[PDB]
Design a binder for this molecule. Structure first.
Ligand SMILES: C[S@@+](CC[C@H](N)C(=O)[O-])C[C@H]1O[C@@H](n2cnc3c(N)ncnc32)[C@H](O)[C@@H]1O
Ligand SMILES: CCN(CC)Cc1ccc(CNC(=O)c2csc3nc[nH]c(=O)c23)cc1
Lengths: 237, 239
């Protein structure tokens, strides 16, 4: 009955408590908006040492994940999905960088089977055969795909209806009015509810321009927001 | 220990995912990593005031107070000792983390990471105490705990003894046993070639895969004579 079924293929399923016990994903799991199941490839091995790493063909340092244990856990995950259209995602640095655009696309799916790789990664033929899409969470290399898998689940979950632009946010201020010789901008303490809306929007635009100008090349600035940005750039030291 | 990490988060027990598992866990055991947590809620004035307060000027949502954060931070600073500690705020508004930044962060002796929730943080605390602001990518998460864990993991691989985007290129494909799987056979160069044939093929595959998937990384990185030939040969023979 859940609006998104997620199956995670990982040798560390305990690690995923970070999303099952905490936050919006945890809430969604309880509310039944998200079914979160794990599939340890180690419980699909033929030896007592639960060996899941194989040597690489052509030498070189590192290990490759063993194909048969992965095959097992994937088949089992596919089985539990039922009649749901399940997209198989491999979390990989070589994948399509995840952006909110991709998150919206992934949120439209009814089932997601996420492969959390380890060591040097998973065999190319295994990808070629089973994987539907490859995603990266950013241009940095991590030790495994469990944290990227959890990041993907969290990002998509917020979009699931009931769980809860291209412009950075405005700065935020809370109690006290003055702290360590630093005072809250007057516009917030004494100002119109449309002039606070004005200032916040102007700060949003300005901070985006200052830090993430690329997000503004993508965006198409309106008349109203170009004037507030011009005001920001000119009213700045 | 080699590197000292202190995490300022309202969910300190979430960090069990990196302290108990993988390379980071190994590093903590081996004594290369020192992982500590600092809950801001155990620093309020009264145990009645929440960590989340109201935003000045109205609007929807909540903000994180300066005092609870300031307490945890001054305390985290104390435990670092004589170590030069860089204070990082994990935020979507920060500049995007790349392997370049990871290498820079790995050179540090101590790191104090600030994880916030969906609520903002009072700008004055940032202005005053934060040394760097980092984002893990252009997507919205509920909080900075997973980005904090991602930062710690990325950095700990670089710590000597614990064990794409290295040379600005993606990686080559990988193949393991069996020689033939699902009617697909391991490229001969790996089964029969020498250690020079293999280097050349792997480099050609890394170039080709980068060109195919992340052409932007190639606009940035300049291509050499040997590389352009390996890439031309990749493009022209791909099909
Ligand atoms: C040592 S890393 C990748 C090594 C190498 N670049 C490769 O994939 O051939 C091992 C695993 O961590 C995951 N991973 C690492 N960095 C990632 C990132 N930036 N985004 C998503 N997954 C990542 C993937 O599941 C990958 O198979
Ligand atoms: C209070 C302002 N929020 C909009 C109502 C903006 C906002 C703040 C904090 C978050 C939570 N994000 C992080 O803590 C975070 C920390 S690092 C990071 N990297 C990529 N994406 C991220 O969401 C993050 C999300 C939105």
């Amino acid at each position: 009955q859940s609006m998104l079924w997620v199956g995670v293929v990982s040798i560390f399923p305990e690690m995923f408590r970070a999303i099952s016990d905490y936050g919006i994903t945890s809430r969604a799991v309880k509310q039944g908006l998200l079914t979160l199941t794990c599939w340890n490839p180690r419980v699909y091995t033929e030896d007592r040492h639960q060996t899941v790493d194989d040597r690489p063909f052509g030498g070189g340092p590192g290990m490759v994940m063993k194909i048969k244990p992965l095959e097992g856990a994937l088949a089992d995950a596919r089985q539990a999905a039922g009649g749901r259209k399940a997209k198989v995602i491999y979390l990989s640095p070589q994948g399509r960088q995840l952006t909110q655009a991709g998150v919206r696309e992934l949120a439209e799916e009814e089932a997601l089977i996420l492969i959390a790789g380890r060591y040097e990664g998973i065999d190319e033929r295994f990808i070629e055969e089973h994987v539907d899409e490859e995603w990266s969470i950013g241009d940095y290399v991590l030790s495994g795909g469990e944290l990227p898998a959890m990041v993907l689940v969290d990002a998509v979950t917020r979009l699931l209806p009931g769980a809860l632009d291209g412009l950075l946010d405005c700065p935020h201020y809370t109690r006290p009015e003055v702290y360590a010789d630093k005072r809250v901008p007057e516009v917030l303490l004494s100002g119109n509810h449309e002039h606070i809306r004005r200032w916040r929007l102007q700060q949003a635009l300005g901070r985006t321009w200052e830090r993430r100008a690329d997000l503004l090349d993508s965006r198409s600035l309106s008349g109203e927001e170009q004037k507030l940005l011009a005001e920001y750039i000119r009213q700045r030291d």
